[PDB]
Amino acid sequence: NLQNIIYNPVIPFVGTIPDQLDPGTLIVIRGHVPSDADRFQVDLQNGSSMKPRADVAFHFNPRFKRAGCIVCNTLINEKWGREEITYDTPFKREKSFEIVIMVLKDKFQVAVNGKHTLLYGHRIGPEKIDTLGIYGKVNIHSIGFSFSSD
Ligand SMILES: CO[C@@H]1O[C@H](CO)[C@H](O)[C@H](OCc2ccc3ccc(C(=O)O)cc3n2)[C@H]1O
Ligand SMILES: [Cl-]
Protein backbone atom coordinates (compact mmCIF):
# COMPACT_ATOMS: atom_id res chain seq x y z
CA ASN A 1 0.00 0.00 0.00
CA LEU A 2 3.08 2.35 0.31
CA GLN A 3 3.23 5.50 -1.93
CA ASN A 4 6.47 7.54 -1.45
CA ILE A 5 5.94 11.19 -2.19
CA ILE A 6 9.81 11.64 -2.47
CA TYR A 7 13.28 10.00 -2.43
CA ASN A 8 16.53 11.64 -1.19
CA PRO A 9 14.96 15.03 -0.43
CA VAL A 10 17.18 18.04 0.35
CA ILE A 11 16.72 18.96 4.04
CA PRO A 12 14.89 21.01 5.02
CA PHE A 13 12.03 19.21 3.20
CA VAL A 14 8.42 20.45 3.26
CA GLY A 15 5.79 18.51 1.29
CA THR A 16 2.03 18.36 0.86
CA ILE A 17 0.54 15.09 2.15
CA PRO A 18 -1.53 13.90 -0.82
CA ASP A 19 -4.52 12.47 1.16
CA GLN A 20 -6.08 12.69 4.63
CA LEU A 21 -4.37 11.01 7.62
CA ASP A 22 -7.37 8.77 8.35
CA PRO A 23 -7.09 6.18 11.18
CA GLY A 24 -4.94 3.28 9.88
CA THR A 25 -2.72 5.56 7.74
CA LEU A 26 1.04 4.81 7.89
CA ILE A 27 3.82 7.35 7.38
CA VAL A 28 7.14 5.62 6.58
CA ILE A 29 10.43 7.57 6.73
CA ARG A 30 13.75 5.90 5.91
CA GLY A 31 16.98 7.79 6.58
CA HIS A 32 20.35 8.13 8.33
CA VAL A 33 21.63 10.33 11.24
CA PRO A 34 24.95 12.08 10.43
CA SER A 35 27.93 11.66 12.83
CA ASP A 36 27.70 15.33 14.00
CA ALA A 37 23.86 15.58 14.43
CA ASP A 38 22.52 17.27 17.61
CA ARG A 39 18.84 16.92 16.64
CA PHE A 40 16.34 16.53 13.80
CA GLN A 41 12.52 16.66 13.67
CA VAL A 42 9.60 15.29 11.68
CA ASP A 43 6.72 17.83 11.90
CA LEU A 44 3.11 17.05 10.84
CA GLN A 45 1.81 20.57 10.11
CA ASN A 46 -1.39 22.48 9.35
CA GLY A 47 0.05 24.25 6.27
CA SER A 48 3.59 25.36 5.28
CA SER A 49 3.53 28.94 6.60
CA MET A 50 7.01 30.13 7.80
CA LYS A 51 5.69 33.59 8.86
CA PRO A 52 3.82 32.99 10.98
CA ARG A 53 4.97 29.43 11.78
CA ALA A 54 2.40 26.75 10.76
CA ASP A 55 0.80 24.83 13.64
CA VAL A 56 2.58 21.49 14.27
CA ALA A 57 0.09 18.78 15.30
CA PHE A 58 2.99 16.35 15.87
CA HIS A 59 6.66 17.40 16.44
CA PHE A 60 8.79 14.23 16.64
CA ASN A 61 12.26 15.43 17.70
CA PRO A 62 15.12 12.97 18.36
CA ARG A 63 17.97 14.63 20.35
CA PHE A 64 21.49 13.14 20.49
CA LYS A 65 23.20 15.02 23.42
CA ARG A 66 24.11 12.89 26.54
CA ALA A 67 22.21 9.50 26.49
CA GLY A 68 19.81 11.00 23.88
CA CYS A 69 16.02 11.21 23.96
CA ILE A 70 12.99 11.94 21.79
CA VAL A 71 10.88 15.05 22.47
CA CYS A 72 7.30 15.13 21.15
CA ASN A 73 5.12 18.24 21.30
CA THR A 74 2.45 20.34 19.52
CA LEU A 75 2.85 23.94 18.29
CA ILE A 76 -0.45 25.94 18.33
CA ASN A 77 -0.37 29.69 17.43
CA GLU A 78 3.47 29.67 17.66
CA LYS A 79 3.49 28.31 21.32
CA TRP A 80 4.81 24.81 22.32
CA GLY A 81 2.60 22.70 24.68
CA ARG A 82 3.72 20.21 27.39
CA GLU A 83 6.81 18.27 26.20
CA GLU A 84 6.36 14.47 26.07
CA ILE A 85 9.87 13.02 26.55
CA THR A 86 10.86 9.41 25.76
CA TYR A 87 14.33 8.61 27.26
CA ASP A 88 14.49 5.13 25.60
CA THR A 89 15.60 6.27 22.11
CA PRO A 90 16.60 3.91 19.27
CA PHE A 91 18.40 6.71 17.32
CA LYS A 92 22.21 7.09 17.17
CA ARG A 93 24.66 9.32 15.28
CA GLU A 94 25.84 7.58 12.07
CA LYS A 95 23.01 4.98 12.08
CA SER A 96 20.15 4.36 9.65
CA PHE A 97 16.51 4.11 10.70
CA GLU A 98 13.03 3.34 9.51
CA ILE A 99 10.32 5.40 11.25
CA VAL A 100 6.73 4.15 10.99
CA ILE A 101 4.09 6.56 12.28
CA MET A 102 0.71 4.84 12.60
CA VAL A 103 -2.18 7.32 12.74
CA LEU A 104 -4.87 5.96 15.10
CA LYS A 105 -8.21 7.49 16.07
CA ASP A 106 -6.90 9.15 19.27
CA LYS A 107 -3.06 9.10 18.94
CA PHE A 108 0.04 8.44 16.84
CA GLN A 109 1.94 5.25 17.49
CA VAL A 110 5.57 5.33 16.37
CA ALA A 111 7.88 2.36 15.73
CA VAL A 112 11.54 2.65 14.68
CA ASN A 113 13.42 -0.25 13.04
CA GLY A 114 10.34 -2.44 13.70
CA LYS A 115 10.37 -1.81 17.53
CA HIS A 116 7.63 0.16 19.37
CA THR A 117 9.08 3.58 20.37
CA LEU A 118 6.24 5.85 21.67
CA LEU A 119 2.62 7.02 21.62
CA TYR A 120 1.40 10.62 21.29
CA GLY A 121 -2.24 11.64 21.86
CA HIS A 122 -3.81 13.97 19.27
CA ARG A 123 -3.96 17.59 20.50
CA ILE A 124 -4.89 18.88 16.97
CA GLY A 125 -7.38 16.78 15.00
CA PRO A 126 -5.26 14.79 12.52
CA GLU A 127 -7.73 15.74 9.74
CA LYS A 128 -6.22 19.31 9.94
CA ILE A 129 -2.71 17.91 9.02
CA ASP A 130 -1.81 18.56 5.33
CA THR A 131 1.99 19.05 5.34
CA LEU A 132 5.10 17.08 6.38
CA GLY A 133 8.35 18.91 7.26
CA ILE A 134 11.74 17.36 8.05
CA TYR A 135 14.33 19.76 9.54
CA GLY A 136 17.76 19.52 11.17
CA LYS A 137 20.77 17.24 10.82
CA VAL A 138 19.36 14.13 9.11
CA ASN A 139 19.69 12.43 5.71
CA ILE A 140 16.37 11.10 4.29
CA HIS A 141 16.20 8.25 1.71
CA SER A 142 12.38 8.14 1.45
CA ILE A 143 9.04 9.47 2.76
CA GLY A 144 5.89 7.55 1.92
CA PHE A 145 2.30 6.99 2.97
CA SER A 146 -0.02 4.00 3.12
CA PHE A 147 -3.45 5.71 3.16
CA SER A 148 -6.32 3.80 4.84
CA SER A 149 -8.64 5.35 2.11
CA ASP A 150 -6.81 3.03 -0.47
C1 LIG B 1 13.16 23.13 24.14
O1 LIG B 1 13.00 24.11 23.15
C2 LIG B 1 12.16 23.80 22.06
O2 LIG B 1 11.46 22.56 22.24
C3 LIG B 1 10.45 22.42 21.23
C4 LIG B 1 9.64 21.19 21.61
O3 LIG B 1 9.09 21.28 22.92
C5 LIG B 1 11.16 22.29 19.87
O4 LIG B 1 11.99 21.10 19.75
C6 LIG B 1 12.01 23.54 19.60
O5 LIG B 1 12.69 23.49 18.34
C7 LIG B 1 11.84 24.11 17.32
C8 LIG B 1 12.51 24.09 15.99
C9 LIG B 1 11.74 24.54 14.97
C10 LIG B 1 12.08 24.62 13.62
C11 LIG B 1 13.33 24.22 13.25
C12 LIG B 1 13.80 24.24 11.92
C13 LIG B 1 15.12 23.78 11.75
C14 LIG B 1 15.86 23.34 12.89
C15 LIG B 1 17.26 22.83 12.92
O6 LIG B 1 17.49 21.92 13.81
O7 LIG B 1 18.10 23.34 12.15
C16 LIG B 1 15.40 23.33 14.19
C17 LIG B 1 14.16 23.80 14.43
N1 LIG B 1 13.73 23.61 15.75
C18 LIG B 1 12.98 23.70 20.76
O8 LIG B 1 13.69 24.93 20.59
CL1 LIG C 1 -6.63 5.35 19.51
From Swiss-Prot:
Subcellular location(s) of the protein: Cytoplasmic vesicle; Cytoplasm, Cytosol
Organism superkingdom: Eukaryota
Known tissue expression: Ubiquitous. Selective expression by prostate carcinomas versus normal prostate and benign prostatic hypertrophy.
Cystine bridges: none
Site keyed Critical for binding to sialylated and sulfated oligosaccharides: positions: R53
Residues the record lists as binding a carbohydrate: R63, N73, E83
Domain Galectin: 13-146
Subunit: Homodimer. Interacts with CALCOCO2/NDP52. Interacts with PDPN; the interaction is glycosylation-dependent; may participate in connection of the lymphatic endothelium to the surrounding extracellular matrix.
Comment block on domains: Contains two homologous but distinct carbohydrate-binding domains.
Main function: Beta-galactoside-binding lectin that acts as a sensor of membrane damage caused by infection and restricts the proliferation of infecting pathogens by targeting them for autophagy. Detects membrane rupture by binding beta-galactoside ligands located on the lumenal side of the endosome membrane; these ligands becoming exposed to the cytoplasm following rupture. Restricts infection by initiating autophagy via interaction with CALCOCO2/NDP52. Required to restrict infection of bacterial invasion such as S.typhimurium. Also required to restrict infection of Picornaviridae viruses.
The protein's name in its UniProt record: Galectin-8
Protein species of origin: Homo sapiens (Human)
Shown stretch of the complete protein: 7 to 156 of 317
